[PDB]
Write a protein that binds this ligand. Structure first.
Ligand SMILES: N=C(N)NOCC[C@H](N)C(=O)O
Length: 330
């Protein structure tokens, strides 16, 4: 089997991407944030505290003839931005882009934190990291991908995120028309439950490439590119007036600037992020200070190749017995 679904930016800055997902019978379609940095599929629901729902589409398990309470199971998750959610669990039929999994754990939110409530466009998350991070207790549950894997033509999914445009998540096949050149594959460590890999270095603009190992994670659920302070300082040093602002919470730059590109290494290959991808707009409405899309990972504890980096590539998440990651230009 295979699946193919379009993913669409939620706003003009590509802060996140939503992908429609069919849950239950008859189908209830919710727009989920596909997240290769976590492993829970959770949704706003009829059980979510009413004051914590503001415009989201909800899953109502009582209206699904295939929903079943997973007795005794609860879940609770906290994300890197300090956001959180928790609730109970149903099993139900879940389909993405024509690919159907029966008996998928659908984690129904009873509570969500304010940042979730405030984002009316995101109806929940669909985790695509390794199932070892799944938070369901007392019986850990499998991700949609892990459940689908055996049925897929090939045990892979791909992320093809657009810049200010829709893109695609494919399951079970590699669309050879979706990228240019060849895909370069690189080793993955699953020891922390993430799609963790080692970049071979970087360049800033037209500068020379610096060969240096940068361990990090391929994370579709993180907006920005978080890298060591040395790397990030070398980038922003090439932008007149750029500075790190503790009050704003990162590097900012004059909105009048034209940003340089940033290149990262994948083996002997190179992925170029155009400068425009690194512009996240005014820090507040009408401001002439703009927020940078490359930020320091110091204090996070891990480097994160988030959407800013991933949307510059066609990315293969290869879930074979020994997982690997593939990157191509596009
Ligand atoms: N960051 C990852 N990978 N997952 O979830 C992201 C949702 C969270 N509120 C955030 O904005 O970070």
């Amino acid at each position: 089997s295979t699946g193919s679904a379009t993913t669409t930016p939620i706003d003009s800055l590509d802060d996140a991407y939503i992908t429609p997902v069919q849950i239950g019978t008859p189908a209830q379609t919710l727009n989920l944030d596909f997240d290769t940095g976590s492993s829970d599929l959770w949704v706003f629901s009829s059980e979510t505290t009413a004051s914590e729902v503001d415009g989201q589409t909800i899953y109502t398990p009582s209206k699904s003839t295939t929903a079943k309470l997973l007795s005794g199971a609860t879940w609770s998750i906290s994300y890197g931005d300090g956001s959180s959610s928790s609730g109970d669990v149903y099993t139900d039929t879940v389909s993405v882009g024509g690919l159907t999994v029966t008996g998928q754990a659908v984690e129904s939110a009873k509570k969500v934190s304010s940042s979730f409530t405030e984002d009316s466009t995101i109806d929940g998350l669909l985790g695509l990291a390794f199932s070892t991070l799944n938070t369901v207790s007392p019986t850990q549950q499998k991700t949609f991908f892990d459940n689908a894997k055996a049925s897929l033509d090939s045990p892979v999914f791909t992320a093809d995120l657009g810049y200010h445009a829709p893109g695609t998540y494919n399951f079970g096949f590699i669309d050879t028309t979706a990228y240019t050149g060849s895909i370069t594959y690189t080793a993955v460590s699953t020891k922390q439950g993430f799609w963790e890999w080692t970049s071979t270095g970087y360049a800033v603009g037209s500068g020379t490439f610096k060969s240096t190992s940068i361990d990090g994670i391929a994370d579709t659920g993180t907006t920005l590119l978080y890298l060591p302070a040395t790397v990030v300082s070398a980038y922003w040093a090439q932008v007149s007036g750029a500075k790190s602002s503790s009050s704003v919470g990162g590097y900012v730059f004059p909105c009048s600037a034209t940003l340089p590109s940033f290149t990262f290494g994948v083996g002997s290959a190179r992925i170029v992020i155009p400068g425009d991808y690194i512009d996240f707009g005014p820090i507040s409405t009408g401001s002439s200070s703009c927020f940078g899309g490359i930020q320091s990972s110091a204090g996070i504890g891990i480097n994160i190749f988030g959407d800013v980096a991933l949307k510059a590539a066609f990315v293969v998440f290869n879930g074979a017995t020994t997982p690997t990651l593939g990157f191509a230009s596009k």
